[PDB]
Amino acid sequence: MAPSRPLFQNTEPVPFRLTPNLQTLMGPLATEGIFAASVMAIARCLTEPEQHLEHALTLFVRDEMMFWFTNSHRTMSLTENQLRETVQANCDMIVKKALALAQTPQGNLPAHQTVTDLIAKATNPMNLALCDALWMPYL
């Protein structure tokens, strides 16, 4: 969570970890046939009715917000309206991320094109070289 504002932020060059060594262990055929399709399968199965994921995430997000406010030592009001607003916003952000992966294109493009774009971004050496040394972008 962002130390300044109550939001879910990563702020890293890549969306997730997929380095050359894991890619080589999987292999191109498997990377195309299993990895790419499974992510979209999970997203589709979880976001079938869009009101289920938010209901599942409500309590988790509420607990995260309570921890953040307590650690910042700046509640000073225990305002229920603020809690409700922040919880709704964070749940909406997470559900937006989940719904992006489960959406099919409009033209004659393959079903999982967003996942392919994300994999290209995560394997691009240009942004794979801006990571920290402890992250070991190589391997």
């Binding site: 191109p28 392919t116 290209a120 394997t123």
Partner: peptide
């Protein structure tokens, strides 16, 4: 390029690790 090679790139396909990069 290189017909019937699985290392070719295509905007609709993953890059592949055995070639330098797209």
């Amino acid at each position: 390029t290189v017909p019937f090679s699985i290392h070719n790139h295509n905007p609709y396909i993953t890059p592949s690790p055995y070639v330098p990069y797209p």
